[PDB]
């Protein structure tokens, strides 16, 4: 069972949010596939890690209200770097 939920990360006092992402695809069916931005790695002791509500394999649907379903990896990274100390992520998990 999957679920879309919201996760806010605050990197105050940390070097970065701690997420590494990649463009990926999963088969939503049985005869179709969906593409998107997925969390490929999480940095230990980073906000993403300490949060505990973000998992490797989760897909990022939006960032601070911006749809990133079809964004390039670099575009999402730029968006994150343009943010202050916080980013609100719409996450699809499980």
């Amino acid at each position: 069972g999957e679920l879309i939920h919201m996760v806010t990360l605050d990197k105050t006092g940390k070097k970065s949010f701690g997420i590494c992402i990649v463009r990926g695809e999963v088969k939503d069916s049985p005869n179709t596939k969906t593409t998107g931005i997925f969390i490929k790695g999480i940095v230990p002791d980073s906000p993403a890690h300490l949060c505990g509500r973000l998992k490797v394999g989760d897909r990022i649907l939006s960032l601070n209200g911006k749809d990133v379903r079809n964004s390039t990896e670099q575009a999402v990274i730029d968006l994150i770097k343009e943010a202050d100390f916080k980013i609100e992520l719409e996450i699809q998990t499980f």
Binding site: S16, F17, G18, I19, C20, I21, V22, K40, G41, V43, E73, Q74, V76, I77, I80, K81
Partner: peptide, 5 residues
Amino acid sequence: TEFCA
């Protein structure tokens, strides 16, 4: 690993 923030 590229694309981390």
